[PDB]
From a paper:
Anthozoan chromoproteins are highly pigmented, diversely coloured and readily produced in recombinant expression systems. Here, high-resolution X-ray crystal structures of four open-source chromoproteins, gfasPurple, amilCP, spisPink and eforRed, are presented. Like GFP, chromoprotein monomers have a β-barrel structure that contains a chromophore, which is autocatalytically constructed from adjacent X–tyrosine–glycine residues encoded within the protein sequence itself.
We believe that this is the first observed instance of a chromoprotein chromophore without N-acylimine formation. The closest structurally characterized protein to spisPink is the blue fluorescent protein amFP486 (53% sequence identity), which has the same KYG chromophore with sp 3 hybridization at this position.
Numbering used by the authors:
A (entry chain A): 6 to 65, 69 to 224
B (entry chain D): 8 to 65, 69 to 224
The structure:
C-alpha cells in the first residue's frame, strides 16, 4: 500500500476572491480506505476573509474515499506519484472560481497545494455577505475519459433564512500515465464545517465520501 | 395511478431553426419505475439533428420509490405536473423545453414544446453521430413546493467519444403536495432505431430513487 490505514495531511492554499488575496494553511488526519478525513485550518494571510470560507472548503482530497473492492480506486492508484486536478466552480448567481490542486506524498504525509482564483461574486450575495451555513451533501459523478476522471457535481450551499445557492463543479482529475480505470460511478459525500473561533480565522473540516455504481 | 398505465406524447419544436413534431404511444408501470414508448417524427423528418437530444425530454411519474420517501411526481396526480427544463451541452448547443403532464382516464398525456439552438454544424448532434445516453443520477432538491432536478448526463458519440450535457429542471405540481427530502433518482434510457431513415424510434427507461447514506 502506498497509503497507510491512517495518514497525516497538510494544506497550503493561496488565492484571491474578488481581488482579495488570502492564504490558508491546514493540518489533519485521515483514514483513506474508510473515506474519512478531518483537518484544522488557519487563515494566515488576508483574514478575516471578506467572503464565505465555505467557497474554498470543498477544494480543501480525493484519495479519502471508501471504495468497494470490485471498483478500481483511481485516486489511490495515483500514489505514490500523486494527482493534480483543475476545477471550475460556477454559482447560479454568477460567482465563479477556477482552482488547481496538487496532491503529493512525503513519507507518512499527504501534501495538498492549491491556487484558487475567484471572481464575479455579487457584492450583496451570500458569499460576499458571509451568510452561508455549509454545504448540503451530494453525489459527485465520476466519468473515466482518456486516462483522466471527470468529476461533475451539483452542490447546494446553505444560506441564512432557509435559502440555498446552487453551485456546479466541473473537475478534471489527472494521475500520471494511468493504466487502470474504473467504470463510470458516483461518490456520495458530506462535508461538515466547524467554526473554531467567532472572528473567522480558524475552522475545522470533516468529510466522509463513499463510492458506488448505479444499479440501472 | 394504476399498476399499468398507457401514455401518449406530442412534442413540437425547432432545433437550429428546423421545425418538427414527434408523436408517441406507450405503456409503463409507474411504481416499478419502468416505461417504454414508440415515437414517430410526423413533421420535419428525417430530422437534421440527433433524436437523442429530445429523448430525455420524452415522464417523471415512472420511478421506483421506497415507501419511506414521498413520491412528488405521483402525488401530483390526478391534477398533473408541469415542468421547465434547461439543456446545455459542453459545445454550446442548448435547449429550453416546457412539458405538461396530465391524466385522462387510464392514459397519461405528455405535451412538450422544445426549442433548441446554437448546435455546432460539425458537432455530433447536427452530424447525427450519437449513440444514446449513458446512465446517470438526477439530484432532486425540494424548494418551496417544487422539485429542482439537476443532472450531468453524457451523450455517447461514434468513435468512443462523449458529449457532456447539463440539465436544470423545475418540476411544479399543479396542486401542493407533501414534500420529499433531498434525494437522487438513478436512470437508464435506451434508444432503439425502428427504421433506417430516422422517422421511428423506441425508447425505454428504468428510474429508481435513493437517499444518500452519508
Amino acid at each position: 500500500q502506498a497509503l497507510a490505514d491512517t495518514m497525516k495531511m497538510t494544506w497550503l492554499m493561496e488565492g484571491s476572491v474578488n481581488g482579495h488575496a488570502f492564504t490558508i494553511e491546514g493540518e489533519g488526519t485521515g483514514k483513506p480506505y474508510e473515506g474519512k478525513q478531518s483537518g484544522t485550518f488557519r487563515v494566515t494571510k488576508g483574514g478575516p476573509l471578506p467572503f464565505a470560507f465555505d467557497i474554498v472548503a470543498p477544494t480543501l482530497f480525493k484519495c479519502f474515499m471508501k471504495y468497494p473492492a470490485d471498483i478500481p480506486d483511481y485516486f489511490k492508484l495515483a500514489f505514490p506519484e500523486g494527482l493534480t486536478y483543475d476545477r471550475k466552480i460556477a454559482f447560479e448567481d454568477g460567482g465563479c472560481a477556477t482552482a488547481t490542486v496538487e496532491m503529493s506524498l512525503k513519507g507518512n504525509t499527504l501534501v495538498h497545494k492549491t491556487n484558487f482564483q475567484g471572481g464575479n461574486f455579487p457584492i450583496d450575495g451570500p458569499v460576499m455577505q458571509k451568510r452561508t451555513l455549509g454545504w448540503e451533501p451530494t453525489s459527485e459523478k465520476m466519468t473515466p475519459c482518456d486516462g483522466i476522471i471527470k468529476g461533475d457535481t451539483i452542490m447546494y450551499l446553505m444560506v441564512e433564512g432557509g435559502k440555498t445557492l446552487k453551485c456546479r463543479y466541473e473537475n478534471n482529475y489527472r494521475a500520471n500515465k494511468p493504466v487502470l480505470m474504473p467504470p463510470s460511478h458516483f461518490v456520495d459525500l458530506r462535508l461538515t464545517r466547524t467554526n473554531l473561533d467567532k472572528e473567522g480565522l480558524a475552522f475545522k473540516l470533516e468529510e466522509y465520501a463513499v463510492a458506488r455504481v448505479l444499479e440501472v
